[PDB]
């Protein structure tokens, strides 16, 4: 729902989602071949 | 050879009468002088 939904919010009041007690896999978000820009600062995109 | 930047040269002359198929003879190699430069060598080439 945070990626594919009916509509989103604005910048003055944006959606704040917390991920807790759930395993996450960032491997699917890298080989999607559908994103325009993938800026990931601080940590390397392949060693996170 | 190159250990700790030191250059080692082992030269020894041995008379033989042959063009190929080096014999099974034994001959030691004695050094002449140590060259302590202290650099790294990764490539070499002979001159004709």
């Amino acid at each position: 729902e945070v990626f594919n939904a009916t509509r989103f919010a604005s910048v003055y009041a944006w959606n704040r989602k917390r991920i807790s007690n759930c395993v996450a896999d960032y491997s699917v978000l890298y080989n999607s071949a559908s994103f325009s820009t993938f800026k990931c600062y601080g940590v390397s995109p392949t060693k996170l | 050879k190159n250990i700790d930047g030191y250059f080692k040269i082992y030269s020894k002359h041995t008379p033989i009468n042959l063009v190929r198929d080096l014999p099974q003879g034994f001959s030691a190699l004695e050094p002449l002088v140590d060259l302590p430069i202290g650099i790294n060598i990764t490539r070499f080439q002979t001159l004709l």
Binding site: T37, K39, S44, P45 | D4
Partner: protein, 97 residues
């Protein structure tokens, strides 16, 4: 030793940089004078810096108006070997009987 007038310049210091982000670790008894850009995943920068290109050679910023922890320190490392090669820097003494 701390240098207060040798390397402490008012207009900063840009001649001395230190590697922070590069993946290639310098092994002992080695040297690397390559100035490249750190690559983070895709887009190998290596000098075409841009999208996902970090500057590894961070600057010090030596200034005389900073604290003791930010002043430049000239460090000299003197290495040698023992029981490995004949001594030549010994400063030979006199020959006795």
């Amino acid at each position: 030793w701390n240098s207060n007038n040798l390397d402490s310049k008012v207009g900063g210091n840009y001649n001395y940089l230190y590697r922070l982000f590069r993946k290639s670790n310098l092994k002992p008894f080695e040297r690397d004078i390559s100035t490249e850009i750190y690559q983070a995943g895709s887009t190998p920068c290596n000098g075409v810096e841009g999208f996902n290109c970090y500057f590894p050679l961070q600057s010090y910023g030596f200034q005389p108006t900073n604290g003791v922890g930010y002043q430049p320190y000239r460090v000299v490392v003197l290495s040698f070997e023992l029981l490995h090669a004949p001594a030549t820097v010994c400063g030979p003494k006199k020959s006795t009987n």
